[PDB]
Amino acid sequence: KIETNVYCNLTPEQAAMYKAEVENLFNNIDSVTGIKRKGMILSTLLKLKQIVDHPALLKGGEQSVRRSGKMIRTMEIIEEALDEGDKIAIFTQFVDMGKIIRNIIEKELNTEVPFLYGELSKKERDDIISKFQNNPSVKFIVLSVKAGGFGINLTSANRVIHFDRWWNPAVENVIVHKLISVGTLEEKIDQLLAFKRSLFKDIISSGDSWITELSTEELRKVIELSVGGY
Numbered sequence: 001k002i003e004t005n006v007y008c009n010l011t012p013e014q015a016a017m018y019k020a021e022v023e024n025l026f027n028n029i030d031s032v033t034g035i036k037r038k039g040m041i042l043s044t045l046l047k048l049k050q051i052v053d054h055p056a057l058l059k060g061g062e063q064s065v066r067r068s069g070k071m072i073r074t075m076e077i078i079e080e081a082l083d084e085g086d087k088i089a090i091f092t093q094f095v096d097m098g099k100i101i102r103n104i105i106e107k108e109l110n111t112e113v114p115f116l117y118g119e120l121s122k123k124e125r126d127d128i129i130s131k132f133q134n135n136p137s138v139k140f141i142v143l144s145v146k147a148g149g150f151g152i153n154l155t156s157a158n159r160v161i162h163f164d165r166w167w168n169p170a171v172e173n174v175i176v177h178k179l180i181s182v183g184t185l186e187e188k189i190d191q192l193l194a195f196k197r198s199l200f201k202d203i204i205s206s207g208d209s210w211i212t213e214l215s216t217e218e219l220r221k222v223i224e225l226s227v228g229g230y
Contacts, residue, residue, distance in 0.1 A: 003176035005190065006077070008069040010052060010181055010227070017051045017058070018184060019225050029216060038212045041219065045185070045208060048223060052181040053097045053164050063100045070179045071104065074161060077177055078105070081159045082139060086175070087132070089157035091143045093166035095119075098144030101163065105140055116143040116152070132156060147207075169193065170205045183227035192222075 010018060025044040032040055050057040054068045065071045074090070081088055092098050095117050102115045114128040132141040133156045145151055145166045162178045165186065180186045193200060203210045211222065 001173045001176060003178065005180050006073055006177045007180050007182050007187075008073045010069045010184065011055075011067060011072075013055055013067060014051055014069060015225060015227060015230065017055060018048060019230060021047050021051065022224050025223075026216070026220065029219075041212045042208070044223070045211065048185055049164060050094065050097075052184050052186055053092065053094065054100055056100060057094065057096050063103055065104060065108075069181065070163060071101075073179065074101070074163070075104075075108070077159070077161060078109075081175075082109075084158075086158040087136065087139055087141075087156050088159045088161065089132075089141050089143065089154050090161045090163055091145060091151070091166055092163040093145060093147065094164070095144040095146065097163065098142045102142045105142075111139060113140045113142055114138065116141065118144075118146055118149050129154070165189070168205075169200075169207070183225055185223040187226075188222045 021044055025040065029037065029040060047058060053070060054063070055061070056063050056067065061067075065075050078088060090101055092101065098115055098117060102113045105111070105113045114132055116125060116128055120128070128141070129152070132138050132154060136156075141154065141157070143152065151167065157174060159175045160177065162176070164179065178190075180190055193204075197204075200210075211219070214222065
């Protein structure tokens with residue numbers, strides 16, 4: 001297996017939203033402490049993760065490829081993969097992003113895109129898994145794994161796109177792609193783990209927890225947009 005990062009630049013719209021939210025967090029973070037500080041950071045982290053996926057998760061509007069640096073690279077990967085005859089699985093931590101991805105693909109490629117999410121009944125789920133695993137025609141499957149949810153190992157997939165960081169840090173041929181938003185917390189967090197996993201080996205399990213406890217300066221290093229021009 002070959003796993004690798006795919007760097008995707010945010011669109012101007014995305015960069016502007018990302019920046020505003022980062023400025024909003026730092027404008028009010030000094031007022032609170034303790035519990036209220038933890039929750040304030042948590043809300044910002046959530047919005048930023050959604051913004052780097054697709055502006056429509058927060059502003060609604062057109063669910064187009066064009067509005068998302070990641071969606072734009074995803075259709076490029078898809079084009080190359082279908083030509084190789086790949087069966088493609090795309091994972092995201094947000095049920096809403098999963099639907100957007102599924103809608104875009106069905107519309108642009110006119111093919112059926114089964115969608116796995118937690119609320120599905122067992123049968124709907126098993127049936128969808130069986131359909132992707134046994135029918136070579138079915139070229140796609142979208143999976144949204146919420147926090148506290150678990151992944152799945154779809155052996156029939158030849159290509160896997162991890163749309164955002166949905167997976168468990170502690171754990172972590174099929175061609176694997178990890179989408180990463182250039183100059184954002186997605187890039188920072190990835191860089192930090194890959195540098196000295198030894199330092200984090202303790203804290204790594206408990207998720208974003210370590211992030212909500214960083215000093216305000218350390219936090220700014222992690223989330224502020226570090227794109228030229230900004």
